[PDB]
Design a protein around this ligand. Structure first.
Ligand SMILES: [Mg+2]
Lengths: 128, 8
């Protein structure tokens, strides 16, 4: 998929944000912005431009699940790719995230190799 | 079994 694509990395922890950010750089994706919760995320999303969301699951204010749901209910943002990040591959989550239209799923901690999979998977499902 | 079926 196109390299100039604009990412939004959403996580309450800045280290996780910086990890994901650098992993994306490694795979040749340099256009990344950050947010610390769902509300922060939504606020930046409404500036337009973004083509992919990587979101943490557990966040005060508005967790990733609520965020994803808001994106899907949003007329302009409904189709946006959203990869959900979680600390546990709990069956219930994977379902929850599926129900809500999560494009993909990943457990932290995760390697660059692992991220390349998930992104590519997403890209081939949607035609990016 | 779940992850796969879902395209995850
Ligand atoms: Mg968190």
């Amino acid at each position: 998929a196109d390299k100039e694509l604009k990412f939004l990395v959403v996580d309450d922890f800045s280290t996780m944000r910086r990890i994901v950010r650098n992993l994306l750089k490694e795979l040749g994706f340099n256009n990344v912005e950050e947010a610390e919760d769902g509300v922060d995320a939504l606020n930046k999303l409404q500036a337009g431009g973004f083509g992919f969301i990587i979101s943490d699951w557990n966040m005060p204010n508005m967790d990733g699940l609520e965020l994803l749901k808001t994106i899907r209910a949003d007329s302009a943002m409904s189709a946006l790719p959203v990869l959900m990040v979680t600390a546990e591959a709990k069956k219930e989550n994977i379902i929850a995230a599926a129900q809500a239209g999560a494009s993909g799923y990943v457990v932290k901690p995760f390697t660059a190799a692992t991220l390349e999979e998930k992104l590519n998977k997403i890209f081939e499902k949607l035609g990016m | 079994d779940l992850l796969d079926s879902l395209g995850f």
